[PDB]
Design a protein around this ligand. Structure first.
Ligand SMILES: [Cl-]
Ligand SMILES: [Cl-]
Length: 336
């Protein structure tokens, strides 16, 4: 199909000829979307900057303050940082014609948009834990992590080095009382903390760890295609879902190419390519593939077991110094 971008926006984007992206989306997961968008619009050269969530924020703020060349479009899983920027004058207002039935809590008016509904899952190495050994609750994982064999065998986020690690563990702490028991079991099991999914997965795949808690189901699905021993367990007591936020740089040199790429990401075409080929868990329900809301809800035991973090100015509460203090004081003491 063809994203419903205005023909004037397509022509203005052809005159630009170039799109600069700053994204936290691993290029391995983004590549089929970049390739399909280039098929749709062969007259746009894409520069894809695969970067950490905190680095995207710091670099965009710096380059903007210097009056320097920056990104046309920012795409990041660190929801609070994206909502902060889009609510402080960094976002180009644009009403996507592909976002007409987005819920109000999946967009910041016309400033920024949900592009995904991506669960925080458990991944494990089947050579070391069989599917039957891997509990699907915070209470059951706390019990497994009491076992001597699990000491040194757990990976999770470092929320002090990954801004999305903070997004995901902060939401878990806020919504699930059992997260506290689980965090103390991270301490008991001497959990190693990582600033990226890839660094935690590498250790699970080698067997250095048996289990990783809280990383993107999107990355796990795609890694499974080439790594037979990767298992995925979905939490049935409650699953945190992030929504990768996209917004256009207010000072983009190529605003129209950015509009085309945003509309593509939100379109049936982009969302189906996410669900079927990229194996990024799509935001849209009307999709076919393995990485769908329907597949997520079936695995966790209903939509009511998913807490989707909203794309809302309300989530900036998580950046309040007292709220960061409460979470990080509890966290640091539990996991050491
Ligand atoms: Cl790391
Ligand atoms: Cl939702």
């Amino acid at each position: 199909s063809r994203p419903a971008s205005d023909p004037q926006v397509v022509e203005a984007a052809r005159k630009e000829g170039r799109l600069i992206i700053y994204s936290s989306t691993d290029q391995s997961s983004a590549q089929a979307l970049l390739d399909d968008f280039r098929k749709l619009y062969p007259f746009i050269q894409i520069e894809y900057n695969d970067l950490g969530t905190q680095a995207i924020y710091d670099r965009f703020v710096s380059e903007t303050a210097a009056g320097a060349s920056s990104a046309d479009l920012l795409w990041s899983s660190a929801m609070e940082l994206q909502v902060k920027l889009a609510s402080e004058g960094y976002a180009l207002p644009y009403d996507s014609p592909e976002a007409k039935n987005w819920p109000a809590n999946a967009r910041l008016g016309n400033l920024a948009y949900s592009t995904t509904l991506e669960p925080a899952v458990v991944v494990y190495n089947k050579r070391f834990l069989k599917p039957e050994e891997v509990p699907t609750t915070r209470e059951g994982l706390a019990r497994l992590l009491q076992e001597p064999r699990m000491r040194g065998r757990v990976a999770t986020w470092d929320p002090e080095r990954s801004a999305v690690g903070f997004t995901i563990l902060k939401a878990d702490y806020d919504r699930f009382p059992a997260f506290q028991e689980l965090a103390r079991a991270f301490g008991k099991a001497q959990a190693a903390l990582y600033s990226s999914t890839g660094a935690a997965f590498e250790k699970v795949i080698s067997g250095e760890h048996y289990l990783a808690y809280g990383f993107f189901g999107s990355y796990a699905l795609l890694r499974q295609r080439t790594v037979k021993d990767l298992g995925i367990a979905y939490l049935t007591d409650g699953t945190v879902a992030i929504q990768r936020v996209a917004f256009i740089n207010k000072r983009a040199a190529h605003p129209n190419a950015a509009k085309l790429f945003l509309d593509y990401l939100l379109s049936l075409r982009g969302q189906n390519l996410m669900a079927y080929t990229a194996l990024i868990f799509a935001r849209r329900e009307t999709v076919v593939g393995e990485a769908t809301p329907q597949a997520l809800y079936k695995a966790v035991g209903g939509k009511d077991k998913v807490y989707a973090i909203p794309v809302s100015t309300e989530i900036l509460k998580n950046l309040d110094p007292a709220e960061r203090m409460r979470f990080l004081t509890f966290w640091r003491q539990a996991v050491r």
